[PDB]
Design a protein around this nucleic acid. Structure first.
Ligand SMILES: [Zn+2]
Lengths: 94, 52, 44, 248
RNA sequence: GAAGACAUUGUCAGGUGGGGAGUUUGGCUGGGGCGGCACAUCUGUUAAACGAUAACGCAGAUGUCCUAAGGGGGGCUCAUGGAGAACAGAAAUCUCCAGUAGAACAAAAGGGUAAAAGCCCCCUUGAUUUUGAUUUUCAGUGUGAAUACAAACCAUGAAAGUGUGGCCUAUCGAUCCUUUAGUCCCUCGGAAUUUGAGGCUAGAGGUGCCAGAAAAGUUACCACAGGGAUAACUGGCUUGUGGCAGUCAAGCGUUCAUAGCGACAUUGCUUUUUGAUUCUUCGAUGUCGGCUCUUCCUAUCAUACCGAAGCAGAAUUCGGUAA
RNA sequence: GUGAUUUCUGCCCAGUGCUCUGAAUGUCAAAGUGAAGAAAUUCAACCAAGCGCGGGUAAACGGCGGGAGUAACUAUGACU
RNA sequence: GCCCUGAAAAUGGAUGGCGCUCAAGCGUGUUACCUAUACUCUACCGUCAGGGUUGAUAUGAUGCCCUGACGAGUAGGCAGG
RNA sequence: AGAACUGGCGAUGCGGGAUGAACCGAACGUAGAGUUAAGGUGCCGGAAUACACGCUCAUCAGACACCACAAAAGGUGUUAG
RNA sequence: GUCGAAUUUGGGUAUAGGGGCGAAAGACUAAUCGAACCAUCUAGUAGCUGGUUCCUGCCGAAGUUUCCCUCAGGAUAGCAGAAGCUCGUAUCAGUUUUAUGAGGUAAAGCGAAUGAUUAGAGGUUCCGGGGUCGAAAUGACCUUGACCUAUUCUCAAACUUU
RNA sequence: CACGGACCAAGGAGUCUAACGUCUAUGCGAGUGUUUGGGUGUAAAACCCAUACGCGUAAUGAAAGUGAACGUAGGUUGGGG
C-alpha cells in the first residue's frame, strides 16, 4: 500500500472542529518502561523459586501487522490515529 | 450430527406464538428527525386540549 | 539396565552417546573416560 | 508403501528442483503412479524396498524429515505374519534458495556467531546460509533444524528490483564473491525522487554500473515475526540484494 | 616446617549441570497411525421450486492487493468478424461497416452492469468525527461483515444528487499485560510543587487448535478405572472379488456353429474363502497345525448300471442315475 | 571397552562429544567507574569464566555413496 | 395364465403342525359366522370442571348434594396417605 | 456410511402376522351385555368339509403383505387368445 | 550338572528404601520389588463401574441448537412439572376457501464444451516458462512448450427460454 | 450364550452446616431485627432492656464529585371495580 504524507481530515481539536490538514506518520510502539505496574508485579512474582510463573506465548500465526497512522493537525498540533488493514508493504508518498 | 427429527413436534407442543402487536409501537427505530418533531407535536396537542 | 549405568540398556550392547565424559561432569555421569585429551591406540 | 513429499511453502522452488533432478538421476524406475497433493506429491510403490531406496535418494539432495507408519491390511493366520501398508512422510525444510531468514538467537550464536539476519545460499543435504554484509557462511543440518524449526522472513516473491548506480569494490573477497559498497536506486523511485541507498552487498563483482538487480526492501516492508522484532533495528540494512536480473 | 593476606569460609552474580526433581506430550477420523483440515471462513453443487438440512461428499477459494483498483463528475464503447491502405504478412498503425456484451470490472465461483459498475480524462480524501438502531451466523450473546438514517465537517458536480472504502457475496481476534491518541480531566487518601505511577474514553501488539492452556518420547517390566460406544479369534448381514451351474458360442477342432473347448458381454447361486461395516462376547466363549474319533452333504476320484463319440477291438473322452 | 591362543585390527577429526600448554574482543551477569537529572532512575564505557574462532583426538560416539572424461568400440575393484 | 425344468450343502424338520387334490391350492365374487383392553349402553372407583346449600340443620361449607367429560406411561415433577 | 418430511419404538400393554421392540388393527380405571376391526371359519382352534365360475396333478406342488431367497433361457404339458 | 575348589556352610559383624547389594536376571532386600513393610495426611480424586429402602393419584419427556483441549462431560436454548397472577370467550388455529406474492424441482425442450472421442490430410508458429550453473561479461544445457483447416460421436451431457 | 444374585436374619446409602435464589405462612411495617451484652429467674428454659450495628429508606461515576415535581407526580391507548 502507499499513503500521501499529508491529508485533509476532520480535526477534533477544540479550536478547529473542522477539516484541517494533517501530516501523517506511521505509529511505532513505545519503549515499554520498567516501572509499569504489570512489570513490577511480574518481577516480584518471578523473584524466587518456582521457575517461570507466567505463560510464554509461542504459537504465532499472523504474518502482518495493522498499520496505524498518526495524523498531526498543522493548525493546532492535535493528533489522531487511523488504522488500515493488514498489508505486507507500507510506505509514505512523499 | 444435525438430525432434525422431533424438532417440529417439540416446536408445536407449546405452540408457535405471534409477537402480540399493540397500539403505539416504539419510536426507537424510526427517523430521529421525525421523532424529534413528533415529541413537540404531541406536547402541543396536549397543551391545547388541556385548557379546552 | 538404564537404572544401573549411563551406558546401560538397549537392544544391542553399545554405549550410544560419546564415552568421553567431561571433566566438569557431576558424580553419576563420570562413567567412561574422564578428561580424555586423546583416545585410541596410537600406532601399536 | 507410499512416500508423501511435502513442503509447507507456496513457491515450491526446491520441490521443482527436485522433480527436475529426478529425471536426471532416473530414480523413477519403480514408480507405480505419481499422485499430486496440496503442496507436495505422493509416490506409490508395491514394496517397502523401493520406498526406502527413494528416501535414501532424497536424503542425499534434499533436507528432509521422515517417519514411517503402517496400516494392517490383513492378519493372515497359520503363520502369524500379517501384510502391511506402509506410509512415509518426507517433509522438506521450508526455506528455499534465495530467502531472507532471521535465524534464532542461540542458533546464530552456535553456528560461528554469524549475524542473525541472513540469506539462504545453497540447498543440499544440509542448508547453507550467507551473511550479505560480510562474506560469512554457516551450515544447518535438517536434524538440528527440526528440533526448533523456523520459517523464512520474506519469500522470493517479495523481491523488488533496483538499478545499480555505483559499484565500489573496496571490500574483502572470499572465493567466487567480493564485498562492496554498492549504491542502488529503486526503479519506482528514480524518475520521480532523487534518493539512493548504500549497501555492502556480496554481489560486488557480479554486477556492474547501470544494470538491473533484484533484492529485498526492508524500509517499506511490514513484518510480524518475533525473531525480527528482537533484532536491533539500527543494524538491519534497508536493502538486501540477492541476485542480478541479467537481461537476455 | 611450609604457605601467607593468597587459599579457606560466608553472601550475592554468571556458566555448566537427565546426576536428580516436578510435569506435559491438541481434536476430527469406515479402528488407531500417516496424509488432509471437512478446526475460523467464501462460491457453485449435494439440496429434493420459501427458509433450514449431513458425510475424511464433489469442483475450487481466503489469511492477500489498491492513494487508486476509494469518492464525485464528464466524454466514449467492448470481445470478435468483414472490407480496404507503402514496407506490413497469421499478427505492428490507420479508416469504415456489422457487433445484447460473445469483453472488462485485482484475486475462487456465482450474481450484476452499455450515454455503465467497463475504457480514458479532471478534481479530490466519505478509507473522517460522535455514538445509537437494524440484518447475517445466533442463545437472537460475542467477533467479523454489511444496511438505513441523525448531528458535524468536507469532497465532487452547472445541478438534482452521490460518497461512512473497494459493484455484491470471504479477506480475520476477548480477559490479564504493554503502548499510543484525547479532556490536559480524576487519584496518589496529613498539606503542597515537580518527576514517577495509577485511572477514564478510543486504537495497536495475539492467541490460524481462529469463544483464544505455556509443553517431547518410550514401555516386550508395566499399572488402574472402564468400554463390544471400538478393533481379537468364533458367529450375523454382504458378493466387489474366490468357486461352480446354465444363456446366446466369433472361431478352433481336417470346408465337420456343439463328440469336446474357447470370444464379447450376460443371468444367478452356494459361506465351504479375499474384502466391507461394527451388530453379539472387554467382571475372559482357551488362540494355528497335527494326532484321535463320529456323523452329514454332493459339486462322483474309484466301484455298480446306462447313454453318446474322428467308440473296429483294446484303451480313452463326455454325460445320466447314483453318496 | 573388548573378551584365551594364532593372525590382523584398513580409510575418515567434516558432525556430535572430549581436550588444548593457540589468537584476542566478537558476545558477556552482579559489583565497581563515568555522564544527565532535584533524586528515584536512565544511558555509556570497561568487562571473569563460558560461548564463538583455531588445533588435536576414532581400541571416543560414529561413518565408510555416487557422476563425468581418457579417440577407432569399450571405461576399468586404473588415471583425472 | 397354471404347472415342470433351469433351482446345489452339509444334526432330522417344518404353508405353525396334521393333512389336503371337482382342495382344506390358485384367481374372483356373494353371503353367513368367530372375536380385542377398540366402538355403544349401564353400574362403580378416582381426577378435573361447572353449579346449588351459612334457611341455618350436627355453630361444621374442611363438608353435603346435582351435572358433564376423562383415565396408557420410563427418566422426572407434584399431591394425598 | 450420511441427510429430508411424517409415523412409530425407545416409554407400550391388547387382538392378528405360529414365535419377533418397529408391520396390520387399536392405544389401557374395575366389571356386565351387545357389535366390530386386522385376521380367519377341515382338525389342532372359537367360526360355512358354505355357495358360484374356471385353472393346476408337481418321482423336492402350492397356500396370510413386511417375511424370512430367487432370475436369464426353455417344455406341440394344459388352457385361453 | 559339578564334587578340592572363583567350593559348601554355622556363628559374629557392616551396608536400609529413590536407599542397599548385584560374576547384571531389573535379580535379591522376611511367600512383598520396574522402588519393601508399618502408621498418618485420608473418608486422597475419579467426567468412570455397581447400588440407592413405602403405597396410591394426576401430569409427563429427551437423545436436538450454540460454545467449550469439546466427542462416556458440562453450560445454553428447547421439550416437562409445579406455583400461580390478570381477566372472561377476547384473541386465536400443524385446516380449508377467496384475493394477492415468492420459487425454478419434476416434466418439457435443448445442442456443445475439451479431456476418453476410434483423431485423420498433418503442422512444422520453432511463442517461451521453470530449475541448476553462470567475478552473469557472455550465456550453456534439464527441459517443456504449439497440432492445424474443415470437422468425426450418440448422446456423453453443459445450460437455460416455458 | 451381557453383568450381580446359593439361602436367611440384623445393619446399609441425597444428611448436617455457612452464604444464597424463587415460592409460601407469620409478625411488624418506612421501618425492622430482644438473646454480643445487661437485668432477672421456679435457673442452659421463661420474662424484661439501653446504646450501637446489619439490611431497607437514593442513585450514579474509575474518581473528584453531583444527587431525583413545568404539571390536579404529566399526556395518549386499553383496564377490573
Ligand atoms: Zn487542529
Amino acid at each position: 500500500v502507499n499513503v500521501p504524507k499529508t491529508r485533509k481530515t476532520y480535526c477534533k481539536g477544540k479550536t478547529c472542529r473542522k477539516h484541517t490538514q494533517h501530516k501523517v506518520t506511521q505509529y511505532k510502539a513505545g519503549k515499554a518502561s520498567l516501572f509499569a505496574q504489570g512489570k513490577r508485579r511480574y518481577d516480584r512474582k518471578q523473584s524466587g523459586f518456582g521457575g517461570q510463573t507466567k505463560p510464554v506465548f509461542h504459537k504465532k500465526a499472523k504474518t502482518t501487522k495493522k498499520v496505524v497512522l498518526r495524523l498531526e493537525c498543522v493548525k493546532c498540533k492535535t493528533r489522531a490515529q487511523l488504522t488500515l488493514k493488514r498489508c505486507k508493504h507500507f510506505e509514505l508518498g512523499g | 450430527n444435525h438430525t432434525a427429527h422431533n424438532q417440529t413436534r417439540k416446536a408445536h407442543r407449546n405452540g408457535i406464538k405471534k409477537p402480540k402487536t399493540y397500539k403505539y409501537p416504539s419510536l426507537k427505530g424510526v427517523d430521529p428527525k421525525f421523532r424529534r418533531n413528533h415529541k413537540h407535536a404531541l406536547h402541543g396537542t396536549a397543551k391545547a386540549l388541556a385548557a379546552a | 539396565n538404564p537404572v544401573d549405568h549411563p551406558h546401560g540398556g538397549g537392544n544391542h550392547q553399545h554405549i550410544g552417546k560419546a564415552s568421553t565424559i567431561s571433566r566438569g561432569a557431576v558424580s553419576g555421569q563420570k562413567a567412561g573416560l574422564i578428561a580424555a585429551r586423546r583416545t585410541g591406540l596410537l600406532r601399536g | 508403501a507410499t512416500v508423501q513429499i511435502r513442503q509447507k511453502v507456496p513457491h515450491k522452488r526446491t520441490f521443482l528442483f527436485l522433480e527436475q533432478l529426478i529425471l536426471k538421476h532416473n530414480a523413477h524406475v519403480d514408480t507405480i503412479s505419481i499422485s499430486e497433493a496440496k503442496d507436495g506429491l505422493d509416490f506409490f510403490y508395491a514394496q517397502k524396498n523401493h520406498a526406502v531406496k527413494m528416501i535414501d535418494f532424497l536424503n542425499a539432495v534434499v533436507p528432509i524429515k521422515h517417519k514411517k507408519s503402517e496400516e494392517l491390511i490383513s492378519q493372515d493366520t497359520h503363520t502369524g505374519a500379517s501384510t502391511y501398508k506402509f506410509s512415509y512422510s518426507v517433509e522438506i525444510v521450508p526455506i528455499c534458495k534465495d530467502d531472507l531468514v532471521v535465524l534464532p538467537k542461540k542458533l546464530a550464536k552456535s553456528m560461528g556467531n554469524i549475524s542473525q539476519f541472513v540469506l539462504c545460499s545453497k540447498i543440499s543435504n544440509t542448508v547453507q546460509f550467507m551473511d550479505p554484509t560480510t562474506l560469512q557462511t554457516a551450515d544447518l543440518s535438517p536434524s538440528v533444524y527440526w528440533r526448533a524449526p523456523f520459517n523464512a522472513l520474506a519469500d522470493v516473491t517479495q523481491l523488488v528490483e533496483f538499478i545499480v548506480l555505483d559499484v565500489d569494490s573496496t571490500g574483502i573477497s572470499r572465493g567466487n564473491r567480493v564485498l562492496a559498497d554498492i549504491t542502488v536506486a529503486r526503479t519506482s523511485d528514480l524518475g520521480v525522487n532523487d534518493q539512493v541507498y548504500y549497501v555492502r552487498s556480496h554481489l560486488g563483482g557480479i554486477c556492474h554500473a547501470g544494470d538491473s538487480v533484484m533484492g529485498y526492501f526492508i524500509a517499506n516492508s511490514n513484518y510480524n515475526s518475533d525473531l525480527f522484532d528482537g533484532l536491533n533495528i539500527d543494524y538491519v540494512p534497508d536493502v538486501v540484494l540477492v541476485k542480478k536480473l541479467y537481461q537476455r
